[PDB]
Amino acid sequence: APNFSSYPFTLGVASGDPLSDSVVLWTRLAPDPLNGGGMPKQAVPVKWEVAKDEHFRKIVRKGTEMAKPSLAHSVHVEADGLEPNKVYYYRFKTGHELSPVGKTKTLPAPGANVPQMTFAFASCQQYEHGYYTAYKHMAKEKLDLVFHLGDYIYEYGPNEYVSKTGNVRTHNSAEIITLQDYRNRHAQYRSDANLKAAHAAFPWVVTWDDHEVENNYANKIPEKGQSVEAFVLRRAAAYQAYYEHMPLRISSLPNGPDMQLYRHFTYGNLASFNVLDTRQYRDDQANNDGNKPPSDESRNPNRTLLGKEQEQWLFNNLGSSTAHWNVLAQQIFFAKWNFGTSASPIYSMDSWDGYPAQRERVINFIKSKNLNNVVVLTGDVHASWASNLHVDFEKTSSKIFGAEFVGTSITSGGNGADKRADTDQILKENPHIQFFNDYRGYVRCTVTPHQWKADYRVMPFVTEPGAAISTRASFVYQKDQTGLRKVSSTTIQGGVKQSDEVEEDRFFSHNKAHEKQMIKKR
Ligand SMILES: [Ca+2]
Ligand SMILES: [Ca+2]
Ligand SMILES: [Fe+3]
Ligand code: NA
Ligand code: NA
Ligand code: NA
């Protein structure tokens, strides 16, 4: 009989990591969410129900979990005994308090011959840079699931990482360090009504990038020559807070600074999804990070992004898959992405171009199995791109093994534009690249056995609430040497047409943030 002085489900509900017979259900009791949750230091019973209908007359599964202080009174339920490829509704009750109703959906039975799948993927939602209008629109989509590919939170204090179009909202605290700091930052982001609606609408498959801990971290090495010892404690705090706020299974429970997040599942026989973790195990960025010429350092063949175990696990999944599609749901730019010239190349040291030997091992394995059904989903870069993936990244004449869809950010970077100052140059230098756009939004994918379609769903602005969404462009890939085909293209009403931004602005703006952090320590 817990009683509350304020409505406890301030962060809503969520579901995730669906399998054919179960799904994770999530909530958190947080009546005062930005001040640590406002809960007493005792375990609180939370009842849960799963039904076939939204009025809960046809309940199929129910139980009681004990929400505990040591996990910020979060609740993770693995609701099993469910049927495959079926929509369910779920809700929680604590004392007399009722959560919002959530909607979810189990996967098809393994090997089921499913004709179609629709999903969206998102990344990069800097709270200060704009409103979450993208998620208002996403919540109205008809999707089987959603992927989040990282930067679900950012770690900064206020007035540090400042958008070109202004910081319209403000982080709740100084730069986040402790478990409580991370919990409160997750609560700030998750309090947004639009994000909560998108969570209540679909099951999510999440994976993190850098800003869930700190900018451009690499395994246990923080950026800018900061302390490794302090960073390891910080990673443990960040990983715990992430678990507490995400609909993950119990095998993802962290143990100190370590946490199993990479994982695999198949959507019938249509698509095999490898959800990667390119932060937790990676070697340090070469050449002091940033955008630099390649070097013996960056080209060192021992350097890894995935780590040895994840690499082998991935090869095992790719080699044994009989699905129509093999998908890498991951964080960072995979295709060749030269910012310089052929003679004097310049590459992102934090992207796959910074880890070329690791990329070679993945491509060589894909070549060895003769695959041409590989799709890579990406975030991080705060703009939309699409590329044909060739078995030799230097030869457009080489065989196309797949495609990469790089999604823009939900908000990071501000209102943006259709085109930037360096767009024509980069496209010229990188002819495998078929698309650039710099408006905020997300990517919607529709998959059938012989065709993959990606729609880029974008808005003219995020600095004010209420922008309309449109499909800027749509591409289809059909597993042949013609690669990506543009099937739609529309100009965005009310959007800036061309800015003077260049890719280096993202690195520069993150470095200005760090400088401001240092100045604040006087
Ligand atoms: Ca970064
Ligand atoms: Ca990132
Ligand atoms: Fe980001
Ligand atoms: Na580094
Ligand atoms: Na080495
Ligand atoms: Na920092």
Hey, what amino acid is at 411?
Answer: T
Token pair 């600074």 in the structure block, residue:
257
H or E segment to which residue 231 belongs: helix 228-245
Hey, what amino acid is at 281?
Answer: Y
H or E segment to which residue 156 belongs: none
SS3 (DSSP) at 26: strand
Cα 225 to chain centroid distance, Å, stands at 26
How far is it, in rounded angstroms, from Cα 355 to Cα 334?
10
The DSSP annotation for 63-81 comes to: EEEEE-GGGTTEEEEEE-S
How far is it, in rounded angstroms, from Cα 177 to Cα 234?
6
Taking the centre of ligand 1 as the mean of its atom positions, its distance from the CA of residue 332, in whole angstroms, is 10
How far is it, in rounded angstroms, from Cα 437 to Cα 386?
10
Ligand nearest to the CA of 283: 4
Taking the centre of ligand 4 as the mean of its atom positions, its distance from the CA of residue 135, in whole angstroms, is 32
Taking the centre of ligand 5 as the mean of its atom positions, its distance from the CA of residue 359, in whole angstroms, is 16
Taking the centre of ligand 3 as the mean of its atom positions, its distance from the CA of residue 331, in whole angstroms, is 10
Ligand nearest to the CA of 349: 4
How far is it, in rounded angstroms, from Cα 398 to Cα 456?
27
* Dihedral sign computed on CA atoms, order 49, 52, 53, 54: positive
CB distance 317 to 274 below 8 Å: yes
Q: Helices 228-245 and 179-190, interaxial angle, to 10°?
A: 40
The token pair that represents 520 in the structure block: 């604040």
CB distance 459 to 133 below 8 Å: yes
How far is it, in rounded angstroms, from Cα 516 to Cα 522?
9
Of 3.20.20.70, 2.60.40.380, 3.90.1150.10, 2.40.30.60, the CATH number of 1-109 is 2.60.40.380
Ligand nearest to the CA of 348: 1
Cα 166 to chain centroid distance, Å, stands at 24
CB distance 298 to 356 below 8 Å: yes
How far is it, in rounded angstroms, from Cα 222 to Cα 353?
20
- Cα–Cα distances in angstroms (integers) from residue 241 to residues 28, 206, 288, in the given order: 12, 14, 29
How far is it, in rounded angstroms, from Cα 487 to Cα 124?
27
CB distance 195 to 410 below 8 Å: no
Any idea where the domains of the chain sit in the sequence?
A: 1-109, 110-522
Ligand nearest to the CA of 518: 6
How far is it, in rounded angstroms, from Cα 382 to Cα 439?
9
| CATH 3.60.21.70 describes domain 110-522 | yes
Ligand nearest to the CA of 223: 4
The DSSP annotation for 239-260 comes to: HHHHHHHS---GGG--BTTB--
The DSSP annotation for 291-354 comes to: EE---HHHH-TT--SS-HHHHHHHHHHHHH--SSEEEEE-SS--S---SS-SSS--EETTSGGG
SS3 (DSSP) at 129: coil
51: β partners: 59, 89
Give me the residues near ligand 1 (ion), CB cutoff below 5 Å.
210, 215-216
How far is it, in rounded angstroms, from Cα 350 to Cα 240?
24
Taking the centre of ligand 1 as the mean of its atom positions, its distance from the CA of residue 320, in whole angstroms, is 34
On the 0-12 / 13-18 / 19+ scale of CB atoms within 10 A, 312 is exposed
Entry resolution (Å):
1.9
Edge-first strand listing for the sheet containing 117-122: 74-79, 23-28, 13-16, 203-206, 145-148, 117-122, 440-448, 451-459, 470-477, 484-489
With a CB cutoff of 8 Å and minimum separation 6, the contacts of 343 are: none
H or E segment to which residue 359 belongs: helix 356-368
With a CB cutoff of 8 Å and minimum separation 6, the contacts of 191 are: 10, 11, 33, 34
Taking the centre of ligand 3 as the mean of its atom positions, its distance from the CA of residue 239, in whole angstroms, is 17
Taking the centre of ligand 2 as the mean of its atom positions, its distance from the CA of residue 306, in whole angstroms, is 16
Give me the residues near ligand 5 (ion), CB cutoff below 5 Å.
302
The token pair that represents 297 in the structure block: 């350092």
Ligand nearest to the CA of 382: 3
Ligand nearest to the CA of 300: 5
Cα 480 to chain centroid distance, Å, stands at 28
Taking the centre of ligand 5 as the mean of its atom positions, its distance from the CA of residue 297, in whole angstroms, is 9
